[PDB]
Amino acid sequence: ATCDLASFSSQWVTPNDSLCAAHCIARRYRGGYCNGKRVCVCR
């Protein structure tokens, strides 16, 4: 998807929605999984 498109290899912190997004969900967020820029900010 966004940022983590095709063969993922972002030169920053891995989106890892499986864990990062899951944590986001804990706080009423949809899921990070790398935002528009390249940070897994919860949203």
Question: Could you give phi then psi for residue 20, rounded to 5 degrees?
Answer: -65, -50
Task: Provide the experimental method for this PDB entry.
Answer: NMR
Q: What is the dihedral of CA 5, 8, 13, 18, to 10 degrees?
A: 80
Identify which of 7, 35, 8, 37 has the alpha carbon closest to the alpha carbon of residue 20.
35
d(CA 1, CA 21): 13
d(CA 7, CA 24): 24
CB atoms within 10 A of CB 42: 18
Q: What is the CATH number of the domain that holds 35?
A: 3.30.30.10
- The tokens for 32 are 């990070």
Domain count, the chain: 1
24 is in which domain, residue-wise? 1-43
| Cβ-contact 41, 32 below 8 angstroms | yes
CA distances from 39 to 19, 29 (A): 14, 15
